[PDB]
Amino acid sequence: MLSDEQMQIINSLVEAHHKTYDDSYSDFVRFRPPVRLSMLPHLADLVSYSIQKVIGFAKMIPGFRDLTAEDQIALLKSSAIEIIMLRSNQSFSLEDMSWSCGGPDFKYCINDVTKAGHTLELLEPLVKFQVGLKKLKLHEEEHVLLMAICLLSPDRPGVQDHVRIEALQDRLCDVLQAYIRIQHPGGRLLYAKMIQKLADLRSLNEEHSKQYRSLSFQPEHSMQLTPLVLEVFGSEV
Amino acid sequence: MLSDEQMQIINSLVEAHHKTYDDSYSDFVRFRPPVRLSMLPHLADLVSYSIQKVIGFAKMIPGFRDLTAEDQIALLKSSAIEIIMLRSNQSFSLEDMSWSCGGPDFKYCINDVTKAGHTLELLEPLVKFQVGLKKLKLHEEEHVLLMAICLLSPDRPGVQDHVRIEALQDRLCDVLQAYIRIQHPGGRLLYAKMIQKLADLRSLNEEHSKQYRSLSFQPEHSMQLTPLVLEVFGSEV
Protein backbone atom coordinates (compact mmCIF):
# COMPACT_ATOMS: atom_id res chain seq x y z
CA MET A 1 0.00 0.00 0.00
CA LEU A 2 0.84 3.73 -0.36
CA SER A 3 2.06 6.03 2.40
CA ASP A 4 0.35 9.13 3.76
CA GLU A 5 2.77 11.51 2.06
CA GLN A 6 2.07 9.87 -1.29
CA MET A 7 -1.63 9.83 -0.52
CA GLN A 8 -1.63 13.55 0.27
CA ILE A 9 0.14 14.21 -3.05
CA ILE A 10 -2.54 12.38 -5.02
CA ASN A 11 -5.27 14.28 -3.16
CA SER A 12 -3.57 17.64 -3.77
CA LEU A 13 -3.17 16.92 -7.47
CA VAL A 14 -6.75 15.75 -7.97
CA GLU A 15 -8.16 18.77 -6.15
CA ALA A 16 -5.90 21.13 -8.11
CA HIS A 17 -7.21 19.59 -11.31
CA HIS A 18 -10.85 19.79 -10.27
CA LYS A 19 -10.17 23.43 -9.41
CA THR A 20 -8.86 24.22 -12.91
CA TYR A 21 -10.88 22.08 -15.36
CA ASP A 22 -14.58 22.98 -15.77
CA ASP A 23 -16.51 20.03 -17.22
CA SER A 24 -19.39 22.40 -18.02
CA TYR A 25 -17.24 24.39 -20.49
CA SER A 26 -19.51 27.34 -19.84
CA ASP A 27 -16.66 29.83 -20.17
CA PHE A 28 -16.28 28.93 -23.85
CA VAL A 29 -19.07 31.37 -24.79
CA ARG A 30 -16.74 34.22 -23.89
CA PHE A 31 -14.19 33.32 -26.53
CA ARG A 32 -14.32 34.88 -29.95
CA PRO A 33 -16.83 32.57 -31.65
CA PRO A 34 -15.68 29.77 -33.98
CA VAL A 35 -16.07 30.16 -37.75
CA ARG A 36 -16.20 27.31 -40.28
CA LEU A 37 -7.93 31.09 -41.01
CA SER A 38 -11.44 31.37 -39.65
CA MET A 39 -10.86 29.25 -36.54
CA LEU A 40 -7.70 31.04 -35.34
CA PRO A 41 -9.53 33.63 -33.15
CA HIS A 42 -11.61 31.04 -31.32
CA LEU A 43 -8.78 28.53 -30.83
CA ALA A 44 -6.37 31.26 -29.76
CA ASP A 45 -8.83 32.22 -27.02
CA LEU A 46 -9.36 28.54 -26.16
CA VAL A 47 -5.63 27.97 -25.78
CA SER A 48 -5.18 31.28 -23.95
CA TYR A 49 -7.81 30.31 -21.43
CA SER A 50 -6.23 26.82 -21.14
CA ILE A 51 -2.80 28.28 -20.34
CA GLN A 52 -4.25 30.22 -17.40
CA LYS A 53 -5.74 27.00 -16.17
CA VAL A 54 -2.41 25.17 -16.43
CA ILE A 55 -0.70 27.95 -14.44
CA GLY A 56 -3.38 27.57 -11.80
CA PHE A 57 -2.80 23.80 -11.77
CA ALA A 58 0.98 24.18 -11.56
CA LYS A 59 0.80 26.57 -8.59
CA MET A 60 -0.96 23.85 -6.58
CA ILE A 61 1.58 21.12 -7.31
CA PRO A 62 3.52 20.34 -4.10
CA GLY A 63 6.83 22.16 -4.37
CA PHE A 64 6.28 23.94 -7.67
CA ARG A 65 5.51 27.16 -5.77
CA ASP A 66 8.81 26.76 -3.94
CA LEU A 67 10.82 26.94 -7.16
CA THR A 68 12.30 30.23 -8.31
CA ALA A 69 10.06 32.32 -10.54
CA GLU A 70 12.52 31.68 -13.38
CA ASP A 71 12.25 27.91 -12.99
CA GLN A 72 8.46 28.20 -12.84
CA ILE A 73 8.48 30.23 -16.04
CA ALA A 74 11.04 27.88 -17.61
CA LEU A 75 8.91 24.83 -16.86
CA LEU A 76 5.68 26.48 -17.97
CA LYS A 77 6.99 27.81 -21.28
CA SER A 78 8.42 24.42 -22.31
CA SER A 79 5.53 22.31 -21.09
CA ALA A 80 2.34 24.37 -21.51
CA ILE A 81 1.47 23.03 -24.93
CA GLU A 82 2.11 19.49 -23.65
CA ILE A 83 -0.21 19.84 -20.62
CA ILE A 84 -2.87 21.29 -22.92
CA MET A 85 -2.57 18.23 -25.17
CA LEU A 86 -2.78 15.95 -22.12
CA ARG A 87 -5.64 17.76 -20.37
CA SER A 88 -7.62 17.97 -23.62
CA ASN A 89 -7.84 14.17 -23.65
CA GLN A 90 -10.71 14.63 -21.18
CA SER A 91 -12.88 16.25 -23.90
CA PHE A 92 -11.67 13.87 -26.63
CA SER A 93 -14.15 11.29 -27.89
CA LEU A 94 -13.19 8.08 -29.67
CA GLU A 95 -16.59 7.97 -31.36
CA ASP A 96 -16.40 11.38 -33.04
CA MET A 97 -12.57 11.55 -33.17
CA SER A 98 -13.01 15.14 -32.03
CA TRP A 99 -12.82 17.22 -28.90
CA SER A 100 -16.39 17.74 -27.67
CA CYS A 101 -16.74 20.62 -25.20
CA GLY A 102 -20.41 20.55 -24.26
CA GLY A 103 -22.00 21.68 -27.51
CA PRO A 104 -21.78 21.43 -31.26
CA ASP A 105 -20.42 24.99 -31.40
CA PHE A 106 -17.43 23.79 -29.36
CA LYS A 107 -16.97 20.42 -31.05
CA TYR A 108 -13.48 20.65 -32.61
CA CYS A 109 -12.80 18.16 -35.35
CA ILE A 110 -9.40 18.02 -37.03
CA ASN A 111 -10.56 20.18 -39.93
CA ASP A 112 -11.44 22.99 -37.52
CA VAL A 113 -7.78 22.94 -36.48
CA THR A 114 -6.72 23.10 -40.12
CA LYS A 115 -8.51 26.48 -40.28
CA ALA A 116 -6.28 27.78 -37.46
CA GLY A 117 -3.15 27.34 -39.58
CA HIS A 118 -1.96 23.84 -38.73
CA THR A 119 -1.13 20.98 -41.08
CA LEU A 120 -1.58 17.23 -40.82
CA GLU A 121 2.08 16.94 -39.89
CA LEU A 122 0.83 18.04 -36.46
CA LEU A 123 -2.81 17.01 -36.47
CA GLU A 124 -2.17 13.42 -37.58
CA PRO A 125 0.19 12.56 -34.67
CA LEU A 126 -1.91 14.67 -32.30
CA VAL A 127 -5.07 12.68 -32.96
CA LYS A 128 -3.28 9.33 -32.85
CA PHE A 129 -1.82 10.47 -29.54
CA GLN A 130 -5.29 11.28 -28.18
CA VAL A 131 -6.58 7.92 -29.40
CA GLY A 132 -3.78 5.97 -27.72
CA LEU A 133 -3.99 7.96 -24.50
CA LYS A 134 -7.76 7.53 -24.45
CA LYS A 135 -7.30 3.76 -24.82
CA LEU A 136 -5.11 3.62 -21.71
CA LYS A 137 -8.37 4.34 -19.79
CA LEU A 138 -6.38 6.24 -17.17
CA HIS A 139 -7.74 6.76 -13.68
CA GLU A 140 -8.28 10.41 -12.75
CA GLU A 141 -5.37 9.99 -10.31
CA GLU A 142 -3.12 8.67 -13.08
CA HIS A 143 -4.21 11.42 -15.47
CA VAL A 144 -3.33 14.21 -13.05
CA LEU A 145 -0.07 12.52 -12.00
CA LEU A 146 1.05 12.45 -15.61
CA MET A 147 0.39 16.18 -16.09
CA ALA A 148 2.39 17.00 -12.94
CA ILE A 149 5.20 14.69 -14.05
CA CYS A 150 5.22 16.30 -17.49
CA LEU A 151 5.26 19.79 -15.95
CA LEU A 152 8.06 18.92 -13.53
CA SER A 153 10.46 17.55 -16.14
CA PRO A 154 13.97 18.87 -15.36
CA ASP A 155 15.04 18.28 -18.96
CA ARG A 156 13.78 21.57 -20.34
CA PRO A 157 15.69 24.50 -21.81
CA GLY A 158 16.11 27.24 -19.22
CA VAL A 159 15.80 25.23 -15.99
CA GLN A 160 18.19 26.35 -13.25
CA ASP A 161 17.69 24.03 -10.26
CA HIS A 162 17.93 20.77 -12.18
CA VAL A 163 18.49 18.78 -8.99
CA ARG A 164 15.46 20.10 -7.11
CA ILE A 165 12.97 19.59 -9.92
CA GLU A 166 14.27 16.11 -10.75
CA ALA A 167 13.68 15.25 -7.09
CA LEU A 168 10.10 16.51 -7.36
CA GLN A 169 9.45 14.54 -10.54
CA ASP A 170 11.06 11.50 -8.90
CA ARG A 171 8.56 11.70 -6.03
CA LEU A 172 5.62 11.85 -8.46
CA CYS A 173 6.89 8.96 -10.57
CA ASP A 174 7.19 6.85 -7.40
CA VAL A 175 3.62 7.80 -6.47
CA LEU A 176 2.31 6.92 -9.93
CA GLN A 177 4.18 3.63 -10.07
CA ALA A 178 2.95 2.60 -6.62
CA TYR A 179 -0.59 3.73 -7.49
CA ILE A 180 -0.64 1.68 -10.66
CA ARG A 181 0.49 -1.44 -8.74
CA ILE A 182 -2.03 -1.33 -5.89
CA GLN A 183 -5.20 0.33 -7.30
CA HIS A 184 -5.19 -0.43 -11.09
CA PRO A 185 -6.08 -4.08 -11.84
CA GLY A 186 -4.07 -5.29 -14.82
CA GLY A 187 -1.76 -2.26 -14.64
CA ARG A 188 1.47 -4.22 -14.98
CA LEU A 189 2.47 -2.45 -18.22
CA LEU A 190 0.72 0.86 -17.63
CA TYR A 191 3.61 2.90 -16.19
CA ALA A 192 5.83 2.22 -19.21
CA LYS A 193 2.93 3.10 -21.50
CA MET A 194 2.48 6.42 -19.75
CA ILE A 195 6.20 7.23 -19.87
CA GLN A 196 6.11 6.60 -23.61
CA LYS A 197 3.30 9.13 -24.03
CA LEU A 198 5.58 11.66 -22.34
CA ALA A 199 8.09 10.99 -25.13
CA ASP A 200 5.30 11.35 -27.70
CA LEU A 201 4.51 14.77 -26.24
CA ARG A 202 8.08 15.93 -26.84
CA SER A 203 7.70 15.29 -30.56
CA LEU A 204 4.27 16.94 -30.65
CA ASN A 205 5.78 19.91 -28.81
CA GLU A 206 8.50 20.13 -31.46
CA GLU A 207 6.10 19.98 -34.40
CA HIS A 208 3.84 22.54 -32.72
CA SER A 209 6.69 25.00 -32.08
CA LYS A 210 7.51 24.68 -35.78
CA GLN A 211 4.02 25.59 -36.92
CA TYR A 212 3.68 28.31 -34.29
CA ARG A 213 6.87 29.90 -35.66
CA SER A 214 5.38 30.12 -39.15
CA LEU A 215 2.17 31.74 -37.91
CA SER A 216 3.81 34.16 -35.50
CA PHE A 217 6.12 35.34 -38.28
CA GLN A 218 3.11 36.69 -40.18
CA PRO A 219 1.77 39.70 -38.26
CA GLU A 220 -1.66 39.51 -39.90
CA HIS A 221 -2.03 36.13 -38.16
CA SER A 222 -0.04 36.68 -34.97
CA MET A 223 -2.18 39.76 -34.36
CA GLN A 224 -5.10 37.38 -33.76
CA LEU A 225 -3.28 35.67 -30.88
CA THR A 226 -3.64 36.75 -27.29
CA PRO A 227 -0.95 38.47 -25.22
CA LEU A 228 -0.65 35.45 -22.93
CA VAL A 229 -0.22 33.08 -25.88
CA LEU A 230 2.48 35.33 -27.31
CA GLU A 231 4.29 35.41 -23.98
CA VAL A 232 4.14 31.67 -23.27
CA PHE A 233 4.71 30.31 -26.75
CA GLY A 234 7.23 33.09 -27.51
CA SER A 235 11.00 32.70 -27.36
CA GLU A 236 12.05 35.27 -24.73
CA VAL A 237 14.24 34.10 -21.85
CA MET B 1 -16.79 77.20 -56.27
CA LEU B 2 -14.19 74.45 -55.59
CA SER B 3 -11.49 73.28 -57.98
CA ASP B 4 -11.07 69.81 -59.46
CA GLU B 5 -8.08 68.97 -57.25
CA GLN B 6 -10.11 69.84 -54.15
CA MET B 7 -13.08 67.96 -55.55
CA GLN B 8 -11.00 64.84 -56.14
CA ILE B 9 -9.74 65.04 -52.54
CA ILE B 10 -13.28 65.10 -51.15
CA ASN B 11 -14.24 62.15 -53.36
CA SER B 12 -11.17 60.14 -52.30
CA LEU B 13 -11.84 60.79 -48.63
CA VAL B 14 -15.53 59.88 -48.82
CA GLU B 15 -14.81 56.66 -50.70
CA ALA B 16 -12.02 55.75 -48.27
CA HIS B 17 -14.47 56.21 -45.41
CA HIS B 18 -17.23 54.19 -47.06
CA LYS B 19 -14.60 51.49 -47.61
CA THR B 20 -13.70 51.33 -43.90
CA TYR B 21 -16.93 51.97 -41.94
CA ASP B 22 -19.61 49.25 -42.14
CA ASP B 23 -23.02 50.67 -41.18
CA SER B 24 -24.32 47.10 -40.78
CA TYR B 25 -21.90 46.42 -37.88
CA SER B 26 -22.14 42.75 -38.77
CA ASP B 27 -18.51 42.11 -37.83
CA PHE B 28 -19.30 42.89 -34.19
CA VAL B 29 -20.51 39.32 -33.61
CA ARG B 30 -16.92 38.15 -33.96
CA PHE B 31 -15.72 40.13 -30.97
CA ARG B 32 -15.60 38.57 -27.56
CA PRO B 33 -19.20 39.13 -26.42
CA PRO B 34 -20.11 41.99 -24.07
CA VAL B 35 -20.88 41.28 -20.41
CA ARG B 36 -22.92 43.50 -18.09
CA LEU B 37 -14.16 44.59 -15.76
CA SER B 38 -16.71 42.58 -17.68
CA MET B 39 -16.80 44.84 -20.75
CA LEU B 40 -13.02 45.03 -21.30
CA PRO B 41 -12.82 41.98 -23.64
CA HIS B 42 -15.59 43.18 -25.93
CA LEU B 43 -14.46 46.83 -26.05
CA ALA B 44 -10.84 45.82 -26.55
CA ASP B 45 -11.91 43.85 -29.62
CA LEU B 46 -14.13 46.74 -30.74
CA VAL B 47 -11.26 49.20 -30.50
CA SER B 48 -8.83 46.72 -32.06
CA TYR B 49 -11.10 46.28 -35.04
CA SER B 50 -11.56 50.09 -35.22
CA ILE B 51 -7.80 50.69 -35.34
CA GLN B 52 -7.48 48.43 -38.39
CA LYS B 53 -10.20 50.44 -40.01
CA VAL B 54 -8.43 53.73 -39.28
CA ILE B 55 -5.20 52.36 -40.81
CA GLY B 56 -7.18 51.41 -43.89
CA PHE B 57 -8.67 54.92 -44.00
CA ALA B 58 -5.28 56.59 -43.53
CA LYS B 59 -3.67 54.61 -46.36
CA MET B 60 -6.21 56.10 -48.78
CA ILE B 61 -5.66 59.71 -47.76
CA PRO B 62 -3.89 61.55 -50.63
CA GLY B 63 -0.23 61.73 -49.70
CA PHE B 64 -0.32 59.76 -46.46
CA ARG B 65 1.05 56.72 -48.30
CA ASP B 66 3.91 58.88 -49.55
CA LEU B 67 5.13 59.62 -46.02
CA THR B 68 7.89 57.55 -44.48
CA ALA B 69 6.73 54.49 -42.57
CA GLU B 70 7.96 56.18 -39.39
CA ASP B 71 5.83 59.26 -40.00
CA GLN B 72 2.84 57.03 -40.79
CA ILE B 73 3.37 55.16 -37.54
CA ALA B 74 4.00 58.42 -35.66
CA LEU B 75 0.75 59.94 -36.92
CA LEU B 76 -1.26 56.79 -36.30
CA LYS B 77 -0.04 56.18 -32.75
CA SER B 78 -0.81 59.76 -31.66
CA SER B 79 -4.12 60.10 -33.46
CA ALA B 80 -5.77 56.65 -33.51
CA ILE B 81 -7.78 57.16 -30.35
CA GLU B 82 -8.89 60.57 -31.68
CA ILE B 83 -10.11 59.21 -35.04
CA ILE B 84 -11.97 56.46 -33.16
CA MET B 85 -13.71 59.12 -31.05
CA LEU B 86 -14.56 61.09 -34.20
CA ARG B 87 -15.69 58.14 -36.32
CA SER B 88 -17.78 56.76 -33.46
CA ASN B 89 -19.97 59.88 -33.65
CA GLN B 90 -21.70 58.10 -36.55
CA SER B 91 -23.13 55.46 -34.17
CA PHE B 92 -23.84 57.97 -31.40
CA SER B 93 -27.48 58.81 -30.71
CA LEU B 94 -28.66 61.95 -28.95
CA GLU B 95 -31.85 60.18 -27.88
CA ASP B 96 -30.19 57.30 -26.03
CA MET B 97 -26.93 59.15 -25.23
CA SER B 98 -25.22 55.93 -26.25
CA TRP B 99 -23.43 54.41 -29.19
CA SER B 100 -25.92 52.16 -30.99
CA CYS B 101 -24.28 49.65 -33.34
CA GLY B 102 -27.21 47.83 -34.90
CA GLY B 103 -28.51 45.87 -31.93
CA PRO B 104 -29.10 46.02 -28.22
CA ASP B 105 -26.12 43.70 -27.67
CA PHE B 106 -23.90 46.39 -29.21
CA LYS B 107 -25.58 49.41 -27.64
CA TYR B 108 -22.82 50.97 -25.50
CA CYS B 109 -24.03 53.31 -22.80
CA ILE B 110 -21.56 55.12 -20.57
CA ASN B 111 -21.90 52.54 -17.81
CA ASP B 112 -20.74 49.81 -20.19
CA VAL B 113 -17.53 51.83 -20.58
CA THR B 114 -17.20 52.06 -16.82
CA LYS B 115 -16.94 48.24 -16.80
CA ALA B 116 -13.92 48.45 -19.13
CA GLY B 117 -11.90 50.36 -16.52
CA HIS B 118 -12.59 54.00 -17.33
CA THR B 119 -13.81 56.75 -15.02
CA LEU B 120 -16.11 59.71 -15.53
CA GLU B 121 -13.05 61.92 -15.83
CA LEU B 122 -12.92 60.50 -19.36
CA LEU B 123 -16.50 59.47 -20.04
CA GLU B 124 -18.04 62.80 -19.01
CA PRO B 125 -16.02 64.91 -21.51
CA LEU B 126 -16.26 62.13 -24.09
CA VAL B 127 -20.05 62.14 -24.09
CA LYS B 128 -20.29 65.93 -24.05
CA PHE B 129 -17.90 65.89 -27.01
CA GLN B 130 -20.14 63.45 -28.90
CA VAL B 131 -23.19 65.57 -28.09
CA GLY B 132 -21.59 68.78 -29.35
CA LEU B 133 -20.16 67.14 -32.46
CA LYS B 134 -23.53 65.52 -33.18
CA LYS B 135 -25.19 68.95 -32.92
CA LEU B 136 -22.90 70.37 -35.61
CA LYS B 137 -24.90 68.15 -38.02
CA LEU B 138 -21.79 67.70 -40.17
CA HIS B 139 -22.06 66.72 -43.81
CA GLU B 140 -20.43 63.38 -44.63
CA GLU B 141 -17.80 65.39 -46.56
CA GLU B 142 -17.09 67.55 -43.51
CA HIS B 143 -16.98 64.53 -41.21
CA VAL B 144 -14.36 62.73 -43.30
CA LEU B 145 -12.35 65.93 -43.85
CA LEU B 146 -12.07 66.40 -40.11
CA MET B 147 -10.75 62.86 -39.57
CA ALA B 148 -8.11 63.37 -42.29
CA ILE B 149 -7.17 66.74 -40.82
CA CYS B 150 -6.91 65.22 -37.35
CA LEU B 151 -4.77 62.35 -38.69
CA LEU B 152 -2.48 64.68 -40.63
CA SER B 153 -1.64 66.97 -37.72
CA PRO B 154 2.11 67.73 -37.81
CA ASP B 155 2.07 68.61 -34.11
CA ARG B 156 2.51 65.09 -32.82
CA PRO B 157 5.38 63.52 -30.89
CA GLY B 158 7.61 61.54 -33.24
CA VAL B 159 6.86 63.25 -36.56
CA GLN B 160 9.91 63.69 -38.79
CA ASP B 161 8.80 65.55 -41.94
CA HIS B 162 6.95 68.34 -40.17
CA VAL B 163 6.93 70.49 -43.30
CA ARG B 164 5.42 67.87 -45.61
CA ILE B 165 2.59 66.86 -43.30
CA GLU B 166 1.71 70.47 -42.43
CA ALA B 167 1.39 71.06 -46.18
CA LEU B 168 -0.98 68.10 -46.47
CA GLN B 169 -3.10 69.27 -43.55
CA ASP B 170 -3.07 72.79 -45.04
CA ARG B 171 -4.55 71.45 -48.28
CA LEU B 172 -7.35 69.65 -46.39
CA CYS B 173 -8.16 72.68 -44.24
CA ASP B 174 -8.48 74.78 -47.41
CA VAL B 175 -10.80 72.15 -48.90
CA LEU B 176 -12.94 72.04 -45.76
CA GLN B 177 -13.14 75.81 -45.46
CA ALA B 178 -14.11 76.21 -49.11
CA TYR B 179 -16.61 73.35 -48.82
CA ILE B 180 -18.28 74.91 -45.80
CA ARG B 181 -18.64 78.25 -47.65
CA ILE B 182 -20.20 76.98 -50.89
CA GLN B 183 -22.20 73.83 -49.96
CA HIS B 184 -23.26 74.30 -46.28
CA PRO B 185 -26.04 76.90 -45.87
CA GLY B 186 -25.51 78.84 -42.65
CA GLY B 187 -21.96 77.48 -42.28
CA ARG B 188 -20.36 80.82 -41.49
CA LEU B 189 -19.15 79.69 -38.04
CA LEU B 190 -18.77 75.98 -38.76
CA TYR B 191 -15.05 75.83 -39.57
CA ALA B 192 -14.07 77.43 -36.26
CA LYS B 193 -16.43 75.04 -34.46
CA MET B 194 -14.75 72.07 -36.10
CA ILE B 195 -11.25 73.33 -35.30
CA GLN B 196 -12.30 73.63 -31.66
CA LYS B 197 -13.39 69.98 -31.61
CA LEU B 198 -9.87 69.12 -32.75
CA ALA B 199 -8.61 70.86 -29.61
CA ASP B 200 -11.19 68.97 -27.55
CA LEU B 201 -9.80 65.72 -28.95
CA ARG B 202 -6.32 66.57 -27.69
CA SER B 203 -7.61 66.73 -24.12
CA LEU B 204 -9.62 63.53 -24.54
CA ASN B 205 -6.49 61.89 -25.95
CA GLU B 206 -4.57 63.00 -22.86
CA GLU B 207 -7.16 61.72 -20.39
CA HIS B 208 -7.40 58.44 -22.30
CA SER B 209 -3.63 57.88 -22.33
CA LYS B 210 -3.75 58.40 -18.56
CA GLN B 211 -6.38 55.73 -17.99
CA TYR B 212 -4.78 53.37 -20.50
CA ARG B 213 -1.53 53.63 -18.53
CA SER B 214 -3.26 52.48 -15.34
CA LEU B 215 -4.87 49.49 -17.03
CA SER B 216 -1.82 48.41 -19.01
CA PHE B 217 0.25 48.48 -15.81
CA GLN B 218 -1.88 45.67 -14.39
CA PRO B 219 -1.09 42.49 -16.36
CA GLU B 220 -4.33 40.78 -15.35
CA HIS B 221 -6.11 43.54 -17.29
CA SER B 222 -3.61 44.28 -20.06
CA MET B 223 -3.67 40.57 -20.88
CA GLN B 224 -7.26 41.09 -22.09
CA LEU B 225 -6.15 43.64 -24.70
CA THR B 226 -5.25 42.71 -28.24
CA PRO B 227 -1.75 42.76 -29.73
CA LEU B 228 -2.69 45.60 -32.08
CA VAL B 229 -4.09 47.69 -29.22
CA LEU B 230 -0.90 47.12 -27.23
CA GLU B 231 1.23 48.17 -30.19
CA VAL B 232 -0.73 51.30 -31.10
CA PHE B 233 -1.58 52.59 -27.65
CA GLY B 234 1.86 51.51 -26.33
CA SER B 235 4.81 53.82 -25.84
CA GLU B 236 7.50 52.32 -28.12
CA VAL B 237 9.20 54.60 -30.64
Binding site: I55, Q72, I73, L76, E231 | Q218, P219, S222, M223
Partner: peptide, 10 residues
Protein backbone atom coordinates in the same frame (compact mmCIF):
# COMPACT_ATOMS: atom_id res chain seq x y z
CA UNK C 1 9.76 40.39 -19.75
CA UNK C 2 7.21 37.65 -18.99
CA UNK C 3 5.03 40.43 -17.59
CA UNK C 4 1.85 38.35 -17.53
CA UNK C 5 3.48 35.12 -16.41
CA UNK C 6 5.07 36.81 -13.36
CA UNK C 7 1.66 38.08 -12.35
CA UNK C 8 -0.67 35.08 -12.42
CA UNK C 9 2.16 33.18 -10.69
CA UNK C 10 1.57 35.72 -7.84
Amino acid sequence: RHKILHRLLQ
